[PDB]
Amino acid sequence: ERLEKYRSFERYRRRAEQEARAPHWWRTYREHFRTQKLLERKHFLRELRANVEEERAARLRTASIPLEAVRAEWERTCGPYHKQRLAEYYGLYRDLFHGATFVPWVPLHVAYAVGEEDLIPVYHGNEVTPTEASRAPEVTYEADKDSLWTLLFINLDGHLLEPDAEYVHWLLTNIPSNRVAEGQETCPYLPPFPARGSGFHRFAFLLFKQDKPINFSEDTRPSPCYQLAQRTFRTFDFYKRHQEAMTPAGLAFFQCRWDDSVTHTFHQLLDMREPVFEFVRPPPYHPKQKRFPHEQPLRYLDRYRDSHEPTYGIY
Amino acid sequence: ARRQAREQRIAECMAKMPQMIENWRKQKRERWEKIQADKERRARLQAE
């Protein structure tokens, strides 16, 4: 009686949801399943509050916000952290580095040019058709002077023979500062080739800070190379060999399905018959037959038959 | 002949089916309207 009682449904709901998050003794569903910036920040706010026009629009409920300005500011402040969530959510950190997690810090930007009028961007989790990815994409990531780089683009789940391995698409090395044309093309650019009926493949862009120029002669690949046995590649072991001078700083990944252009890639240059896959569900469970299916309909016999066509044996 | 006679019978009744359903909804609604209308009389409000 001393404690007050929730006077509204929402109060209980907010209490309940917060209550659910906390761990409990009893089994539950979840178990099984700087200062100067502050001062400057405040000062800008006060100016915004003073503006009468801001008040009038708000009370007239006609105000609006510029999305582009927020996006750029969001990138500076906490974009690294949100990007990390997507990478963990999409499984990049577990499939790439065997569970190691790195916060992206370089605001990497990639877009696939469609003709010349417009260019398709590649954000985190975006959808880009293989036709759109036929040619290599423009990359601008605001390196600043010096600080050599290496750009690595790979499809994590596109391998056709070994599950763990993945296929390199193009690898640029010794990229000095912003300019990317000055990079050694160890791996030539290949169009994405996701098999038909194989679901959505996730392709990611990886940028590594380079302390000192290192010749990646082992990772150099002949240009052009159309052999999948040579495109097989593990990010995890590769980063081990270069972890001294390679530290990741950028991310960008997109999802793509199969497409008619994929048919061209499998035949024209890969020079192999294209693989076709289908989603197969497991056979339905039926209890073991009984010689006498007592109290069962006539359909019982059809459940355990394989061929729908009559047979005659000796006749 | 039986098949054709049956088919045309269904078609003729089906042709008038839309209107008949419309009429039966009007009767059902007005039946409800009388209940709600006489329920909401100002005389009922006078008691309220």
Binding site: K5, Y6, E19, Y29, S198, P275, F277, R281, P282 | -
Partner: protein, 100 residues
């Protein structure tokens, strides 16, 4: 009659198996477990049955449940028992059908 728990916690249960029959809500539907008209509990997936307690939030529309919930003391919330089946197999797998 013979009301009770047909399937106990830790049992492999196929898609349609009935888990419990109840005159009153002794247990409540959980995840991948459905309700019958007679309030019996049946699995909706193939998996392992689990009984676990969790907070109860009712549908806003029903008046009686909301009123009782609101009248609860601010300190805590009421609980109930829920039944769960943990799916034990993947939905499906991709296989090579043809090479063109």
């Amino acid at each position: 009659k013979h009301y009770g728990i047909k399937k106990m916690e830790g049992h492999y249960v196929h898609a349609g198996n009935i888990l419990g029959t109840q005159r009153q809500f002794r247990w409540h539907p959980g995840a991948h477990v459905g309700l019958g008209r007679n309030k019996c509990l049946y699995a909706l997936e193939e998996g392992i049955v689990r009984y676990t307690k969790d907070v109860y939030v009712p549908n806003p529309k029903n008046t009686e449940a909301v009123d009782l919930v609101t009248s609860l003391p601010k300190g805590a919330v009421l609980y109930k028992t829920f039944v769960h089946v943990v799916p034990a197999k993947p939905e499906g797998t991709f296989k090579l059908v043809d090479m063109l």
